[PDB]
Amino acid sequence: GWVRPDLGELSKVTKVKTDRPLPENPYHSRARPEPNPEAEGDLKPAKHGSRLFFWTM
Amino acid sequence: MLKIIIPTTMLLPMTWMSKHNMIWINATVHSLLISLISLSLLNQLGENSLNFSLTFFSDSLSAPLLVLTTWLLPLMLMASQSHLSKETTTRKKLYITMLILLQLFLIMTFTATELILFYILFEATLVPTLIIITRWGNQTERLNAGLYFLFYTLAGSLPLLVALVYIQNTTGSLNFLIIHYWSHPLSNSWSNIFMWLACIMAFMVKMPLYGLHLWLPKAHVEAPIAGSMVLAAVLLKLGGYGMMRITTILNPLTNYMAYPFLMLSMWGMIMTSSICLRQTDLKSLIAYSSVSHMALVIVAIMIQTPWSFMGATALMIAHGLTSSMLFCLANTNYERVHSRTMILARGLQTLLPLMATWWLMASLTNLALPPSINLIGELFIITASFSWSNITIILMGMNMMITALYSLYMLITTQRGKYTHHINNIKASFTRENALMALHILPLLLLTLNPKMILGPLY
């Protein structure tokens, strides 16, 4: 009493019901380097201008 | 500060936009006016320099040189409107443009508060002078002359550029006050000598010391009259100003490394003045005399003694005014005879009696005859040098003895003696030449009453 599967039926993505837990880190990833701290605080005018040699501004 | 600068640069549009023939007039008017305003800057306080802003400041050393440069500015215009009369108006305007652009830079560098700012226009004076020597110079070897003058200073200036920026990366700012207050004892590490050499050689070159001086005879002789005065009366003196300013952070390394220059300068002045004793060219003779007087200042500045700085500033100005005058003497004689050989036109006093006088105080002033400012310079330097070492007076006094012989040597060969028979184009001296000559001598004796004005910050 079987039935011939129709076209596309075998290619259907199916939900499989399992009991095994999902792997935590399947790639066995190590700890991640901490990103460098971001910029913060309001922009303030450059102190004493360009500060390049004799240029005052 | 600004009250001198904008009047100087705003003078430039005037000459360009003035009438066809009034260029000499209006330029002379306000150049003298600028001199008056500069004289208002001559005042100084006790110890703190006259500071104006981060960009400009003046002290008891800068002020006498500032008023000298502005005072000079009318004189080239007066001295040049004879060999440039037969020139297109644009070239005359361009010639005037070069002078005031040159003079503008001089006010900038002397009043500069930052060493790099002092440095940028330190060589920027070269470009106008290079044009003056090359284009309007009246000779053939002026081309090689300009090359010698240009390359010598650059060969010395570029080490200063590397040295100066090194100070900035190591000791923060290079503001003249901030260097003086935060001065540190320069070590004896073998790098610090090359540190010392770079910070000094730049001012050495454009302050002709024996060996590094061959550009000056080629600089002065082929240069036109205006070029010769500016080059000999102020240009040889940027090097002087630098040393008084830059030797703040060269101690105690200056104490030990001074020896090769001191021997070179002290011996060089005897050699150079000896050249003056047997120079065939009048302009060259005056040029070599500048080396001798300037080499005296080399010993003066490099001893690093309160008295030595004071006599330096005395010879700083007095030689410049005198050398400009003697170049005027040679120029005022040259076009009449159209030659530079001294023996070409002998016995000029019998023909031109007033020029006999003008040549006479001119020679006496260069003689360091007391109480002329030149004597105050040399005599002060001798005492400072003598305290440094007793032997140097043998070299010191010998220079004065040689300086006597060659100074009157031009007087006897040209002014006194028998007039030359063949020449017949010697006309009575134009009162322009006469007026200019008094424009030089009169402030010199006027300065004799007040040495304290030009003694300097050490005073």
Ligand SMILES: CCCCCCCCCCCCCCCCCC(=O)O[C@@H](COC(=O)CCCCCCCCCCCCCCC)COP(=O)(O)OC[C@H](O)CO
């Ligand atoms: C026509 C030739 C030149 C004419 C004469 C000019 C003056 C002679 C000496 C020229 C010196 C130029 C280079 C100096 C730049 C500034 C020097 C300075 O600030 O001092 C440094 C001195 O250090 C140097 O090495 C400076 C250069 C020494 C000389 C060698 C190169 C210059 C000479 C050859 C090139 C120029 C000559 C012409 C070549 C065609 C300090 O650094 P340091 O070595 O103490 O640094 C910390 C640590 O020790 C390691 O760095």
